[model samples]
Target chain A: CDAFVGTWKLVSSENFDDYMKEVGVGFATRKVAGMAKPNMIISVNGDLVTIRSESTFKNTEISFKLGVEFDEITADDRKVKSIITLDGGALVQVQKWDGKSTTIKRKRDGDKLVVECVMKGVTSTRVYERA
Target chain B: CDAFVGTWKLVSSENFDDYMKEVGVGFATRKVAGMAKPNMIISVNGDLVTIRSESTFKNTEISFKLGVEFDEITADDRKVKSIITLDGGALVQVQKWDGKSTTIKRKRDGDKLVVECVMKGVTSTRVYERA
Candidate 1:
């Protein structure tokens, strides 16, 4: 969690529409989200971790310890069981809802935080710059 | 709404954090939103218009006619009354919540959709590219 601390600004995104479509966002919400850009901040205290996503639309947050499972409400309003683990220099988060599952990997590259999300065969990447 | 139809990808943003802060987003959510960039899609038929903002974080949308007033839930979960008007080639939307109000002007410049949002004395701009 050392490298994940502090605030980050959104730099760019790729294939987010297909990922949201697979996540079952409604048509109206999808349209509004098509242009919404928000920010992210991470805080780490020993073994506990907190990640927050703030925007004019809505703010979603989660807190958990390394390798522990917790209930979470996703940004798309899905209820899921989430777990995070550190693999080398990457933080991997896996979310399971109903019978579906998604995985997100966060890594630091230079001064950029790279997030890769995968669900229902759709994958998207969002890059954030240190602020 | 002909000019506003189709999908638009978020290209860049300015001062969104200050706008969200002025609207009273909490610390945790603000941190999360600090780096979220979503996409917007518009669908128009006759006089009715639908706008959707889609992302892995959250999806929000609104529907209205040229000069109709309706209730809306902002991305940050604020409830407001909204009205949209077409001024020349620009789509102007105004939202009122409590004693505070916000205005968002969207215009097409070539293949880009320019969105300017103002609330509580803070203004932010987001640019989107045709997708």
Candidate 2:
């Protein structure tokens, strides 16, 4: 838990716009997303885990257990079913909607945190540092 | 707990646009909100209670315990301090911000749910029916 529970700041991003486009996010939301450098806070308590993403424009939070499938509304307002599980030191998340699915993997790389997002044939990588 | 826990659909609204204007909601949000008839669902699990308001344009949710103060982001995207308490058959909520405050009272009237919101000496009323 210590490896993944902390406030993290976005340090680098690659192909995130493409990742957003594949998810069907609106153009207005997509425009603001590129200018947003949100800070993500991860915390776990007992059996509940909370992930909060905060920026000047919008804020979002989700709470769930490690492996329970839960209904979630994304920041861009897409309602989907999401499940997360622990694999070694990585947190693997799968979100499904409209017969389409995406996978997000989060892991710690020494001091930096690496997040990989994949949808369709496009893949995006973002790195964050502890804040 | 049984009094305020159920799915309710909005049947009538009065002075809602004025209320939204007073609460600093943007023009775009106000326009979308005026045409969107939202449904509210209330449920409780263990010590946590959830209130979800959903519409075609946007959806909002909050989870907390009775008598416990929690930070909530309102449907209009206003981050405020919120506390909920039960009084007789009414579920009373008070939201505070920037030296201003609002009181929202929800109670069942026979088969209908009545919600009253008051701020700055102005009062708005909305009626809902079980769905």
Candidate 3:
């Protein structure tokens, strides 16, 4: 619902602050995710849109809508049901689970769409520049 | 590591709670993750051990040690560093990754090995019986 209607590429992910927070991002985990930039391509046709997130790290393409609750499946095919709505200029999402809940916020900053996802206490901030 | 030195089978996954509690399990995820039972074949030889988690859901085989650290690559080739050790009658696993670190305590729960995986402030318990 934001500026997510095109292909975007991943530039970098910073987690320097996460380590000092008593969280470990291991050598291998850092090594793999370090030098990589991800890209996302979003195709929008009316209310139906497909967002493709690509990188040397992971590739995930999810399709949903504005103010619609849909099912997003993982690469492993795990089902995560969520509802996406517009909160001002940002795309707000609410995910519910038995023992888990998630709030995702997506916004456009310059040529990049920042996807800020929070689950539990872990926060993953992914930036995707339009391709 | 008790009774986890050989191939294992995934009997079933329970989620009688919430729709969103399905996590990543959806009609497509379930249709795919279901119908078939995954098999995990583990092999131990000296200081090295490999646990092959195979299923229609996802195929992952991780190699590590009794007191050594190892690097594991995901299906998308994302690496996750972890260490595995024996905790009394269970196998304890600690994972260091981006979103969050996961500690898995694996023990035999009757016909299955109850693997309690905790991460991202969420807990998922998977049961795997001896195949």
Candidate 4:
């Protein structure tokens, strides 16, 4: 909802490197990404939500509607059916690809946006501050 | 660089539905995407490039460096290390994921931008008209 609509800069990350490795990223690329921080810009209009990740290294943009399943190709090129749902004050996304599933949760705490990604029983948490 | 720096709209797609299936998109989501047309905006400044895919169903944006490998998550959520290199009049991308690799090529011919995606021995070609 309104809590997620803003520009945010990544401040810290936990287990992201391992998560990427589990997601099949290789040695050199992961090393560069592990050291990079990206900014996220989120916009909400009615049922449409757009999330843009911006950085010097790369930028990614994703737009989807709540409760509607859409096709998504992840940064690593895995094709999946993805849906985003609202849970109280948090936004939850479930991605299913190749018979495997991953869950991502985003919530706003104070002025910080916390995103948690869970896949293959491993979890990574990333924190972003309002910009 | 000037050739790719503009907005383009999807005009025709060949075997894109099957390509999505091969990339692991489910039946229903693929049905929606099969009928949807998207617009792409390409911007180049120095060695950095950004491609934005815009549609009513979903939007995807990717920015990358020339000749530099970077982590990318595709629309279907596959994780891979990808690099883009120029070959003759085309921009070629090679994506490596989970021991399997895919190649995508973008080239300008006449008034259109043609993008070709090759994976699992299947090729999908999409044509976009300048906007």
lDDT of each: 0.80, 0.82, 0.60, 0.81
A92 in model 3: Cα distance from truth in Å? 49
Residue lDDT tens for model 3, B18-125: 221323334555565555577766666545555656655555555455766655544333345678998888889887756546677878776677777665556666
Best by lDDT: 2
TM-score of each: 0.50, 0.55, 0.42, 0.54
- Model 3 residue A22 lDDT score: 20
> Of the candidates shown, which would achieve the greatest DockQ relative to the real structure?
4
Per-residue alpha-carbon lDDT of candidate 2 for residues A29-76, written as tens digits (9 for 90 to 100): 888987888888887765667687776545667766788887666677
lDDT of 3 by residue, A1-131 (tens): 53666667776455433521323335665555555576666555455555555556545555555676655543222345678787878878776644556677888887778877676567777776755
Quote the TM-score that chain A achieves in each candidate.
0.95, 0.96, 0.71, 0.93
* Model 4 Cα lDDT, one tens digit per residue, A13-56: 99998888776778887887788798888877555676877765
Candidate 3 lDDT (Cα, whole model)? 0.60
* Model 2 superposed RMSD (Cα): 11.0
- Which ten residues in a row are the worst by lDDT in model 2 chain B? B70-79
Best by TM-score: 2
Give me the runs in candidate 2 sitting further than 4 Å from their true place: B1-131
Worst 10 residues of 4 chain B by lDDT: B70-79
Local accuracy of candidate 1 as per-residue lDDT tens digits, A1-131: 68899889888989988888897878777776667777887877546576767776566566567897866666666667789999999999999978989999999999899999999789999999987
For candidate 1, lDDT tens digit of each residue in B43-84? Answer: 674455767777765665565667977666665766677899
What is the iRMSD of the candidate numbered 4? Answer: 11.0
Which residue segments of model 4 deviate by more than 4 Å? Answer: B1-131
lDDT of 4 at A95: 90
lDDT of 2 by residue, B1-131 (tens): 77778899999999988888888889999999988888988776556577777777655567667897766656675657789988998989999977888999999999999999989877788899989
